[PDB]
């Protein structure tokens, strides 16, 4: 075969803007995403729930053959997992920030930083709406263009792809390294939701409440002018009326009522929330709306399976890139360990029920090593390797040892 790709890719042209950079989006489109995120209300909350499902349950670092890595780091033993856990102490927060950013924006992006002494400090996320990639004909990123607000207006600069790293959850194709904003992709669905919400709110103001209509004068009788109506307005004023005010009139004054004109705003709200949640890939139940019939049985099993599948796909997409483009370079450059080691980063299942896992452990624990049970139960494996590796319970081994 060949050592370089020989199929081409759809590439550059700046989406047919001019002075070409990025692919098919600009710093203004990026700041449009920023406003959808920061502007609050129901849309912002839903995409915040999407971040929390994908990344909010935290993470665990794995290395295959971790025990083989045992080395004195600074006159003190560590494995590669132990070194990585000390290198990335707050990884649960970083994963939620980067993962959330990579759902909102086309990418999460950031630096590696060093202490003054030149040891690793942190992986530092950058503000993704400020940065856009420049890519070559093969589709790979070569430089990053940044612009940012300052007291003196906008400041602009260009950085090499060497010392930045980036992560893309929403690829257009397996070869895409610029990605898609799900927010820009669903701009019409989001704007339709906002428009219908505004429509309902204003319709409730006009039509949800009755209004008093005083008609003055006899029909086909003497006309009443504006100054005449002002004196009548003074009598029936809702400012000064109270619940049990009573009215006395001649026959030629009529207190009519604009009734509240019924419309099913609840049904329109449910329709809007269905459209928006389906467009953003969330279940309808996330929007504080419940469908009939769908709340039970195999209809529930399917939708909650689809949600868990979508989460696993996003999680693995993130995990692979984070290990390959953040962890491995940090291990290579700042660690006494082998950077080609089989590092993994699992991200926890947000909808796992430990009560269901307990039932599983009771039913089939007889086929699981104590380490496998401890992993499923989300606890440290036993400190003693023979009992960790054995199949029967550590408590059962202890009560049998107590018989010796």
């Amino acid at each position: 075969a060949s050592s370089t790709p020989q199929t081409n890719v759809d590439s550059m042209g700046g989406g047919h803007s001019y002075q070409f950079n990025g692919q098919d989006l600009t710093f203004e489109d990026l700041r449009d995403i920023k406003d959808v995120r920061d502007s609050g209300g129901q849309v912002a909350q839903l995409m915040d729930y999407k971040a929390l499902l994908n990344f909010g349950e935290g993470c665990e670092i794995h290395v295959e053959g971790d025990d083989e890595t045992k080395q004195l780091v600074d006159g003190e033993p560590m494995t590669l997992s132990e070194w990585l856990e000390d290198a990335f102490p707050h990884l649960d927060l970083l994963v939620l920030d980067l993962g959330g950013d990579a759902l909102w924006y086309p990418y999460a992006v950031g630096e590696i930083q060093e202490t003054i002494t030149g040891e690793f400090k942190e992986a530092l996320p950058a503000e993704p709406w400020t940065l856009m990639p420049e890519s070559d004909a093969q589709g790979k990123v070569q430089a990053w263009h940044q612009r940012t607000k300052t007291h003196g207006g906008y400041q602009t600069q260009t950085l090499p792809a060497d010392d930045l790293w980036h992560i893309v959850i929403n690829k257009a194709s397996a070869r895409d390294e610029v990605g898609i904003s799900e927010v820009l992709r669903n701009k019409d669905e989001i704007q339709a939701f906002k428009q219908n919400e505004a429509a309902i709110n204003q319709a409730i103001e006009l039509h949800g409440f009755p209004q008093r209509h005083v008609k003055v004068g006899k029909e086909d009788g003497a006309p009443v002018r504006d100054n005449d109506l002002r004196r009548v307005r003074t009598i029936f004023d809702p400012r000064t009326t109270d619940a049990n005010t009573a009215y006395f009139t001649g026959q030629d004054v009529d207190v009519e009522t604009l009734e509240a004109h019924n419309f099913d705003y609840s049904a329109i709200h449910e329709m809007d929330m269905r459209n928006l949640t389906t467009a953003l890939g969330l279940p309808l139940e996330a929007g504080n709306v419940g469908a009939d019939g769908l709340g039970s049985g195999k209809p529930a099993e399917l939708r909650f399976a689809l949600l868990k599948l979508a989460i696993k796909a996003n999680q693995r997409s993130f995990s692979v890139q984070f290990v390959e483009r953040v962890m491995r370079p940090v291990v290579r450059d700042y660690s006494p360990f082998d950077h080609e080691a089989d590092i993994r980063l699992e991200i926890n299942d947000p909808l796992e029920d430990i009560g269901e896992v307990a039932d599983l452990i009771q039913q089939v624990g007889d086929y699981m090593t104590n380490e496998q049970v401890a992993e499923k139960l989300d606890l440290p494996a036993p400190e003693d390797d023979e009992v960790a590796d054995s199949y029967r319970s550590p408590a059962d081994m202890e009560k049998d040892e107590a018989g010796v």
Binding site: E28, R31, D32, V36, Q191, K194, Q195, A198
Partner: protein, 46 residues
């Protein structure tokens, strides 16, 4: 509050800025000895 117009997303909104007028140079607090007086009238002895 009750705004007559709603603001839509993706900055399809109205252009919402004010351009500043001329701003005069302010220096007296730095360019002189400042006395924070206890009374609105008073005396410096020479």
């Amino acid at each position: 509050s009750d705004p007559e117009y709603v603001d839509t997303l993706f900055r399809e909104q109205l252009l919402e800025v004010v351009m500043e007028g001329r701003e005069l140079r302010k220096v007296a607090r730095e360019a002189s000895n400042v006395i924070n007086a206890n009374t609105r009238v008073g005396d410096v002895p020479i």
